[PDB]
Amino acid sequence: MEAAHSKSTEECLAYFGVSETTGLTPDQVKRHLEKYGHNELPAEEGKSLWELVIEQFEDLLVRILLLAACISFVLAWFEEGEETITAFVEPFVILLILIANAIVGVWQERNAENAIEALKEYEPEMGKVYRADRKSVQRIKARDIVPGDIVEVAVGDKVPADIRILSIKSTTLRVDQSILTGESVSVIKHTEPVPDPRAVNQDKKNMLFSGTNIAAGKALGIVATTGVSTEIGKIRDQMAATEQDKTPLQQKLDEFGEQLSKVISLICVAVWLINIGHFNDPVHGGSWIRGAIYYFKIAVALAVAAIPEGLPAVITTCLALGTRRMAKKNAIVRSLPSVETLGCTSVICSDKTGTLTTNQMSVCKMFIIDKVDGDFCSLNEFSITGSTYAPEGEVLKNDKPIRSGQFDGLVELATICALCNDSSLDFNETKGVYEKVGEATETALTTLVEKMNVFNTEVRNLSKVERANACNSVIRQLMKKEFTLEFSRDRKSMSVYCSPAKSSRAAVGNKMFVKGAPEGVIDRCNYVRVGTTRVPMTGPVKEKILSVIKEWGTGRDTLRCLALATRDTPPKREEMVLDDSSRFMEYETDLTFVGVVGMLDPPRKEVMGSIQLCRDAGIRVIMITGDNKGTAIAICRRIGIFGENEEVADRAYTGREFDDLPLAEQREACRRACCFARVEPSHKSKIVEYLQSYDEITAMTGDGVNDAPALKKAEIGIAMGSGTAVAKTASEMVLADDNFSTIVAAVEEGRAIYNNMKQFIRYLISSNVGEVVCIFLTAALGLPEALIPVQLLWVNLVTDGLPATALGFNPPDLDIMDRPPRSPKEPLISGWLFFRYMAIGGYVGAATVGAAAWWFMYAEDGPGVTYHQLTHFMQCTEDHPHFEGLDCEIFEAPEPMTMALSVLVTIEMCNALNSLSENQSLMRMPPWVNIWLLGSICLSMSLHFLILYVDPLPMIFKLKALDLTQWLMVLKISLPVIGLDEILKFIARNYLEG
Ligand code: NA
């Protein structure tokens, strides 16, 4: 029964055919259970370990590598010899990388928690029902509860289902609905029907929502809905129906995956079409087995040379490090891929209270009526200092300190603020400052009465803790509080019924003290107080009151106003039903206007600044607030969101206004809006949709289960440190301090990190290019293999991975926040950059072959066979050129490989320096700009020497220590790469910058 709140208790009983005194029968229980299912959100998918392990082998590149391991394995099997301790190393090494890769992938999932599963924390194990098969209440499992069940709840219980309250057993009933409505103070519940069938949760004063807690009282009710049909269940469905796209880099990297796959295969064909000469060969003679071993040997190295095997580890390391760095700045990021997205944030939607403001309330102004005489009128306006809850400050009329007590209007004003109030103070001796107890707005009133001291009570003598609630306690003793009529949004006020304290045998003197939003409160005033006297409310004096209120709310003061009034002749106590909240406005009429207080929730000190940063960075800012429209706007002007005097007609909306607009116009409104006031339950989420229809990267703040859907939808959901665990688990980021400025800082960190990622990504991929050239050249020049897979894999994971990581510490550009958001469509490598890395690739691939060849020719240790061209034969079945001497296995000498590999290693260390800046010369941005990079290079070289000397390793990699001559050559052929890029950067700075 979805509409239970708008039905009478009798209609809900009738609908389900259930007896309030016996409850459902065992047949009803069965049937109901068959129709509605059990009371519980559905289980998460049964993602098994075996399935999880399988998923680690889905990516195109890991398939290639697996394939290449199989070929490597078959080759290290279908090969003759006795050296097995240096044969199966390769295929094993490739497999071990894939195992570690899959291991990590699995470790990630075991540690990942989804928000949908966090929802289940709010479903209690047990609940209490009345069923016809028993007399006394039975405590059954909450999943066994069904619509129609008569249920019982009491203080401390977690509501097991969405329930229509039938009967309140205790005096009142109080609920903690913080998790669903953001009302953090316990709300009072009733049993009368709520007329509007489209009432938002906050106004269903007769409902208990599954997952909430009874704060006080005992109640009996009937279950309206269970499972996915409850308020939180609908929230679960929205979240589950939300599909989350891959981050821009994830998408672009997946595109590179396909493309590189397609590239790898083409190069294999290219190596085929180059040997189509073998078709014109005698069928007899030559080795076919060895001919195929030749292709599969290069296909393996080719795949291995082309994959940036260490890239995923480098990225992760970088992101993890950045994350620790962001946490130091109060930004707790939860998902590593979010760090990139955060940098692209084009829109931030922020709640005002507690994020843009401090949520530390303070009364700054107040006024009473001074006199009314015909068309003439004067108010007494005052000021109050002190912006803490501490009772330290003073009242001032025209800056001159006055004494509240000398004004009677003020005695009463204070009596309302003190009596018509459910909050207090407390001096916390631990922190040594005054803290609130209750609501912000109410404690500010408590604070205000203490500064006012309307009865000049001896207060300075009292201790620190006793000082807290002294002037209040005084006012309390003056009036007995008989009862209170709670605040409702329909009337936007509250009242308290009070009788004189010293009273033996009397029935006259009773008062109601009314506090609330000025418009409705003032409309119900027929009288205006003037000291102790009273006069009729008149058209002119009304405008006077309203104009001041308007000025205070809509001006640079940005104050939240509250009207205070009293009912002099309140209805007789017996004539009032304290149960029908719909009668409260009626009991609050024929009032006397006493005064107005204006309070402030101050902007955080950093917000002004942070908002300006965004304007520089081309990031739009939208405030979502509970202020009315005028004040919403005024606060927006105040903080920088709006220009002080600029037009805003079409950039500010209330929920009402926004709902009235047709779908097209709502979408339109969202492109230009910077202020949403009084926003509905569904709005954040619809606002996010529209924003995404313009391809905005959207940040959205929230803190309750009811924000969870929007948090999940937006690309950067942002939760408050002080918020619910569910909102956190639904968000890309948590604000340790709740401060809007933390967001802007974390965006800046994201830009800085992405710029560096581009660098080490381009560095690594460019490294693969040269590796591929080296393999290809060797093949299409019939040379001895210059580099082998085990060597490549070492370079791609260790030798280059260190500098790649060090590149993540590249200093950030000063102009980072002075450029618009990066477009998600922006390609990683494109145009000039393709050429650069193509040329760089060329040179690296040539240098490595040439390093081997030079040893094979113009060097001593190896044959002085210049232009002999090892091209010709690699079979040795004719034995022509080297006539005298029985040697033919010098082709596999470890010296040439060691020349090539040391060239690669040395070049890439050099190219790591060329990677300090995309376009700036090493003349302008020197190597030492990044000490981590310098350190990294020393480490990688020490590691190269490690594999060169430490016995097991030089055999495994197939290497031999180099002569100072040979090393001195390695340098000669490596250092020029620096000159090459310097030239190319020069061409970019001077002949492209237009
Ligand atoms: Na999200």
Residue 716 in tokens: 């950067």
Measure the CA angle with vertex 234, ends 228 and 239; round to 5°: 110
CATH 3.40.50.1000 for domain 346-358+603-745: yes
CA 51 to centroid of ligand 1, rounded, Å: 26
Cα 780 to middle of ligand 1, angstroms: 51
Domain covering 359-602 in this structure, CATH number: 3.40.1110.10
How far is 901 from 905, CA to CA, in rounded Å? 6
The binding site for Mg(2+) comprises 703, 707
List the one residue out of 515, 421, 401 whose CA is nearest residue 472. Answer: 421
Residue 884, φ and ψ in degrees, nearest 5? -90, 110
Q: HSE (CB half, 13 Å, CA atoms) of 876?
A: 8
Q: Would you call 513 helix, strand, or coil by DSSP? A: strand
What residues have CB less than 8 Å from 626, skipping those under 6 apart?
352, 353, 677, 678
CA 538 – CA 44 distance, rounded (Å): 64
Distance of CA 146 to the CA centre of its chain: 36
Measure CA of the first residue to CA of the last residue in the chain; give whole Å.
67
In 700-739, where does DSSP find H-type helix? 708-713, 725-729
Give the active site residues: 351
Residue 515: both structure tokens together: 């506090």
Q: Are 216 and 170 in contact (CB under 8 A)?
A: yes
Place of tokens 């209120």: 549
**Structure-token pair, residue 904:** 């690669």
Amino acid at position 439, single letter: E
CA of 814 to the centre of ligand 1 (A): 29
Handedness of CA 542, 545, 551, 553 (dihedral sign): negative
What tokens were used for 684?
């954040």
Token reading at 366 = 């107040």
Backbone φ, ψ for residue 631 (5° rounding): -75, -40
Q: What is the CA radius of gyration of the chain?
A: 38
Cα–ligand 1 centroid distance for 356 (angstroms):
21
Residue 880 token pair = 């022509």
Amino acid at 558: T
Q: What six digits make up the tokens of 182?
A: 């953001």
CA 285 – CA 820 distance, rounded (Å) = 67
Q: How far apart are CA 707 and CA 289, in angstroms?
A: 66
The shares of helix, strand and coil residues in the chain, as percent rounded to the nearest 5, are 45, 15, 35
Helix, coil or strand: residue 555: coil
Please identify, in words, the CATH class of the domain defined by 12-54+113-240. Answer: mainly beta
Could you tell me if residue 189 is left (phi over 0), alpha (psi between -120 and 50 degrees) or otherwise beta? beta
What is the SS3 assignment for 728?
A: helix
Sequence-distant (≥ 6) Cβ neighbours of residue 442 within 8 angstroms: 421, 422, 423
Provide φ and ψ at 751, rounded to 5°: -65, -40
Beta bridge partners of 566: 513, 592
- Tell me the C-alpha distance between 831 and 516, whole Å: 65
Consecutive H or E run containing 297: helix 288-306
Tokens encoding 736: 């340790």
CA of 804 to the centre of ligand 1 (A): 29
Q: How far is CA 782 from CA 266, 294, 776, 848, in A?
A: 19, 11, 10, 15
Q: Is 729 helix (H, G, I), strand (E, B) or coil?
A: helix
Query: Structure tokens of 963?
Result: 């002569």
User: How far apart are the C-alpha atoms of 655 and 107, rounded to whole Å?
Assistant: 44
Among 119, 337, 112, smallest CA distance to 238 is for 119
Distance CA 72, CA 84 (A): 13
- φ, ψ (nearest 5 deg) of residue 736: -50, -35
Residue 871: count other Cβ atoms within 10 Å of its Cβ: 10
User: Which candidate, 536, 524, 418, 532, places its Cα nearest to that of 469?
Assistant: 418
45-73 exposure pattern, b = at least 16 Cβ within 10 A, e = fewer: eeeeeeeeeeebeeeebbebbeebbebbb
| Contact indicator for 172, 217 with CB cutoff of 8 Å | yes
CA–CA separation, 674 vs 692, rounded Å? Answer: 16
Residue 167: beta bridge partners? 220
The pairing of beta strand 525-530 with beta strand 591-600: parallel
Provide the token pair at 870. 């090892």
Strands in 709-759 per DSSP E? 716-720, 733-735
Q: Which residues of 494-505 are buried (b: 16+ CB within 10 A; e: fewer)?
A: bbbbbbeeeeee
Looking from the CA of 450 toward its CB, the CA atoms found within 13 Å total 29
* CA of residue 103 to ligand 1 center, whole Å: 27
Tokens 């295969």 map to which residue? 265
Amino acid at 306: A
Distance 233 CA to ligand 1 centre (A): 19
> What does the DSSP 8-state code read for residue 699?
E
Closest CA to 733 of 700, 688, 760: 700
Q: Residues 432, 437, 443, CA angle at the centre, nearest 5°?
A: 95
Characterize 263-302 residue by residue with b for buried, 16 or more Cβ atoms within 10 angstroms of its Cβ, and e for exposed.
ebeebeeebeeeeeeeeeeeeeeeeeeeeeebbebbbbbb
Residue 337: CB atoms within 10 Å = 16
CB 700 within 8 A of CB 341: no
709-712: long-range pairs with CB below 8 Å, 24+: 709/235, 709/238, 709/239, 709/242, 709/684, 709/685, 710/684, 710/685, 711/115, 712/115, 712/238, 712/239, 712/242, 712/244
Q: Which of 331, 232, 52 is nearest to 709 (CA)?
A: 232
Cα 155 to averaged position of ligand 1 atoms, centre (Å): 35
Task: Tell how strand 187-188 and strand 560-567 pair up.
Answer: unpaired
Tally the C-alpha atoms within 13 A of residue 500's C-alpha that lie toward its C-beta.
10
What's the CA gap between 892 and 573, in Å, rounded? 108
C-alpha distances out from residue 405 to 168, 412, 414, 454, 695, Å = 44, 10, 10, 4, 61
Ligand 1 centroid to Cα of residue 333, in Å, is 12
- Tokens linked to 34: 């068959």
Q: Are 423 and 445 a contacting pair, CB within 8 Å? A: yes
Q: Which of 562, 591, 632 is CA-nearest to residue 366?
A: 562
Distance from residue 80's CA to the centre of ligand 1 (Å): 57
Alpha-carbon span 234 to 197, nearest angstrom: 17
Specify the DSSP element, H or E, that contains 362. strand 362-373
Residue 165's Cα: distance from chain center in Å?
A: 37
Distance in angstroms (rounded) separating the CA atoms of residues 827 and 251? 11
* Cα 474 to ligand 1 centre (Å): 51
Q: Residue 795, Cβ neighbours under 10 Å: how many?
A: 23
Residues 6+ apart with CB under 8 A from 262: none
Pairing of strands 331-333, 533-536: unpaired
Beginning with the edge strand found earlier in the chain, give each strand of the sheet holding 652-654 in spatial order.
331-333, 733-735, 716-720, 698-702, 347-351, 620-625, 675-677, 652-654
Residue 80 CB contacts under 8 Å (≥ 6 apart), including other chains: none
Resolution, given in Å to one decimal, reads: 2.5
Q: Can you read off the two tokens belonging to residue 830?
A: 């494109």
Rounded Cα gap, residues 18 and 25, in angstroms? 8
Strand order in the sheet with 218-225: 138-141, 126-130, 150-154, 218-225, 162-168, 207-208
733-735 and 331-333 strand pairing: antiparallel
Nearest to 221 by CA among 230, 210, 208: 208
* Count of other CB atoms within 10 angstroms of residue 36: 17
Q: What is the DSSP letter of 634?
A: H
Q: How far is the CA of 235 from the centre of ligand 1 (A)?
A: 15
Would you list which residues are annotated within the binding site? 703, 707
Q: Which of 374, 376, 7 is nearest to 207 (CA)?
A: 7
How far is ligand 1, taken at its centre, from the CA of residue 691, in Å? 14
Q: Which among 286, 271, 69, 426 has a CA at the least distance from the CA of 877?
A: 286
Give the C-alpha separation, 955 to 817, whole Å.
52
Distance 245 CA to ligand 1 centre (A): 10
Number of Cβ within 10 Å of residue 241's Cβ equals 9
Q: Angle CA(503)–CA(505)–CA(510) in degrees, nearest 5?
A: 55
**Sequence positions preceding breaks in the chain, C–N over 2.5 Å:** none
CB neighbourhood size of 948 (10 A): 17
Indicate if 359-602 has the same CATH topology as 12-54+113-240.
no
Separation of CA 729 and ligand 1 centre (Å): 10
Maximum CA extent, the chain: 137
Q: 244 alpha carbon to ligand 1 midpoint, in Å?
A: 8
How far is residue 714's CA from residue 691's CA, in Å, rounded to a whole number?
9
Residue keyed to tokens 């409309």 = 523
Name residue, tokens 């790591």.
Answer: 912
Orientation angle between helical segments 470-478 and 440-452, nearest 10 degrees: 90
Asked whether 970 and 903 are in contact (CB, 8 A), the reply is yes
Residue 469: closest CA among 424, 403, 404, 439: 424
Residue 913: both structure tokens together:
């320096």
591 three-class SS: strand
Q: List CB contacts of 645: < 8 A, sequence separation 6 or more.
A: none
Give CA–CA dist 918/525, Å, rounded.
Answer: 71
Superfamily of domain 55-112+241-345+746-994: Calcium-transporting ATPase, transmembrane domain (1.20.1110.10)
Contact 509, 500 (CB under 8 A): yes
**Distance of alpha carbon 766 from alpha carbon 751, whole angstroms:** 23
Which secondary structure element, helix H or strand E, spans residue 13, and what is its range? helix 9-16
DSSP label of 278 = G
What is the C-alpha separation between 379 and 372, in angstroms, rounded? Answer: 9
Q: How far is CA 383 from CA 397, 444, 550, 581, 598, in A?
A: 6, 14, 17, 35, 10
Per residue, what are the HEC states of 122-187? HCCCEEEEEECCCCCCEEEEHHHCCCCCEEEEECCCECCCEEEEEEECCCCCEEECHHHHCCCCCE
CB 128 within 8 A of CB 144: no
Where do the structural domains in the chain lie, given as residue ranges? Answer: 12-54+113-240, 55-112+241-345+746-994, 346-358+603-745, 359-602
Q: How far is the CA of 698 from the centre of ligand 1 (A)?
A: 9
Amino acid code (one letter) for 402: I
